[PDB]
Amino acid sequence: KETAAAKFERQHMDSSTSAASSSNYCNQMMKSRNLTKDRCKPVNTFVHESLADVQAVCSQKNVACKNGQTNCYQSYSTMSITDCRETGSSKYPNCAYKTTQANKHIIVACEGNPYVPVHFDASV
């Protein structure tokens, strides 16, 4: 079945664009990446950077994850991200989201060998 590392790429990586280009980014991405297949995932962040730059975060600043785990890491640099938050009009299967673009430090949880991002924890 899909690996945690591949899942992270599918849910959170968008190396193909530098930023969201319109308010419809989230609606299109959430759908296309299959995040709304079973239900409307409430929140999701997409990172507009190279895969290598995001994998490198696993060797940056170790910080506790929001849930207390100690396998989280914070990016030394800000990164281009897009926050997707479900709107009041969202109704499965017609999931709807508000798109928010920003430049923030990301916090990911890493695992494995190679040690790569498997979860997106927060943006700060």
The CATH number given to whatever domain includes residue 69 is: 3.10.130.10
The experimental technique behind this entry is X-ray
H helices of the chain, in order, are 4-12, 25-32, 51-55
Residues tagged in the binding site annotation for substrate: 7, 10, 41-45, 66, 85
Range of the domain at 9: 1-124
CA distances from 14 to 1, 30, 66, 107, 112 (A): 22, 12, 24, 16, 22
Catalytically active residues are 12, 119
Name residue 123's beta-bridge partners.
106
Structurally, the chain folds into a number of domains equal to 1
User: 57: which DSSP letter?
Assistant: G
Residues tagged in the binding site annotation: 7, 10, 41-45, 66, 85
